[PDB]
Scaffold this active site. Structure first.
Site, short mmCIF file in Angstrom:
data_model
loop_
_atom_site.label_atom_id
_atom_site.label_comp_id
_atom_site.label_asym_id
_atom_site.label_seq_id
_atom_site.Cartn_x
_atom_site.Cartn_y
_atom_site.Cartn_z
N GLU A 35 -35.31 59.35 70.25
CA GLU A 35 -35.89 60.59 70.75
C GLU A 35 -37.40 60.68 70.49
O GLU A 35 -38.20 60.96 71.42
CB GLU A 35 -35.17 61.79 70.13
CG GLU A 35 -33.76 62.04 70.67
CD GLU A 35 -33.68 62.30 72.19
OE1 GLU A 35 -34.74 62.45 72.86
OE2 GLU A 35 -32.53 62.29 72.73
N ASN A 46 -40.43 67.96 80.55
CA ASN A 46 -39.40 67.59 81.51
C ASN A 46 -39.80 68.02 82.92
O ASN A 46 -40.58 68.97 83.08
CB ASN A 46 -38.10 68.26 81.10
CG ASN A 46 -37.73 67.94 79.66
OD1 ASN A 46 -37.41 68.83 78.87
ND2 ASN A 46 -37.82 66.67 79.30
N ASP A 48 -38.40 69.70 85.04
CA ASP A 48 -38.00 71.08 85.34
C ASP A 48 -38.93 72.11 84.71
O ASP A 48 -38.72 73.32 84.87
CB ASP A 48 -36.56 71.34 84.91
CG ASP A 48 -36.38 71.38 83.38
OD1 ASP A 48 -37.35 71.16 82.63
OD2 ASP A 48 -35.25 71.62 82.92
N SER A 50 -39.43 72.43 81.43
CA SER A 50 -39.13 72.66 80.03
C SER A 50 -39.87 71.57 79.24
O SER A 50 -40.42 70.62 79.83
CB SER A 50 -37.63 72.60 79.75
OG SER A 50 -37.07 71.35 80.14
N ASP A 52 -39.51 69.11 75.46
CA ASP A 52 -38.70 68.72 74.31
C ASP A 52 -39.65 68.63 73.11
O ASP A 52 -40.76 68.09 73.24
CB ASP A 52 -38.07 67.34 74.55
CG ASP A 52 -37.08 67.33 75.71
OD1 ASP A 52 -36.52 68.39 76.09
OD2 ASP A 52 -36.81 66.24 76.24
N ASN A 59 -35.00 70.96 73.30
CA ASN A 59 -35.52 71.41 74.57
C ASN A 59 -35.76 72.93 74.63
O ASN A 59 -34.98 73.70 74.07
CB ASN A 59 -34.56 70.97 75.66
CG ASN A 59 -35.07 71.28 77.04
OD1 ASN A 59 -34.59 72.20 77.69
ND2 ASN A 59 -36.08 70.54 77.48
N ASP A 101 -22.22 72.80 69.96
CA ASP A 101 -22.21 73.54 71.23
C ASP A 101 -21.03 73.17 72.14
O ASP A 101 -20.71 73.92 73.07
CB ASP A 101 -23.55 73.30 71.98
CG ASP A 101 -23.78 74.27 73.13
OD1 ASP A 101 -23.60 75.49 72.91
OD2 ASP A 101 -24.16 73.81 74.24
#
Ligand code: BR
Ligand code: BR
Ligand code: BR
Ligand code: BR
Ligand code: BR
Ligand code: BR
Ligand code: BR
Ligand code: BR
Ligand code: CL
Ligand code: NA
Ligand code: PT
Ligand code: PT
Length: 129
Positions: A35, A46, A48, A50, A52, A59, A101
């Protein structure tokens, strides 16, 4: 901060990530390696919109607030900047929520693609734990 491999393993264990939700420490160390390459300051946008953040590339779409990810949640209730600290506490607290989650560590695409199913024990080999 750029952690060494065993240094991160020690910190992750201290903060109780070792075998959290059943994931051995080497899984967490491997996820961090791919990562962020162990760099607490790593950020990556990202497509979109967003971003990280941190050692575990958490994120902003779901987990932290960066003030620029429209329509996002902040499920860890923290500024994303908090996830860039040399102290990994905020990252670990949030990772625990993420991995609980429902999809386990699959939430980390680099873990699914690069760590899952591999000899993750290699990541803590030689460390004084
Ligand atoms: Br390494
Ligand atoms: Br602690
Ligand atoms: Br392991
Ligand atoms: Br936002
Ligand atoms: Br720490
Ligand atoms: Br913690
Ligand atoms: Br699981
Ligand atoms: Br160590
Ligand atoms: Cl703690
Ligand atoms: Na957010
Ligand atoms: Pt610590
Ligand atoms: Pt802790």
């Amino acid at each position: 901060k750029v952690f060494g491999r065993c240094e991160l393993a020690a910190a992750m264990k201290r903060h109780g990530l070792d075998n959290y939700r059943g994931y051995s420490l080497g899984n967490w160390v491997c996820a961090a390696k791919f990562e962020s390459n162990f760099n607490t300051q790593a950020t990556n946008r990202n497509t979109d919109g967003s971003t990280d953040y941190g050692i575990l590339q958490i994120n902003s779409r779901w987990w932290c607030n960066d003030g620029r990810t429209p329509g996002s949640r902040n499920l860890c209730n923290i500024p994303c900047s908090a996830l860039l600290s040399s102290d990994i506490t905020a990252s670990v607290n949030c990772a625990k929520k993420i991995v609980s989650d429902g999809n386990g560590m699959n939430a980390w695409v680099a873990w699914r693609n690069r760590c899952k199913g591999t000899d993750v024990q290699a990541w803590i080999r030689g460390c004084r734990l």
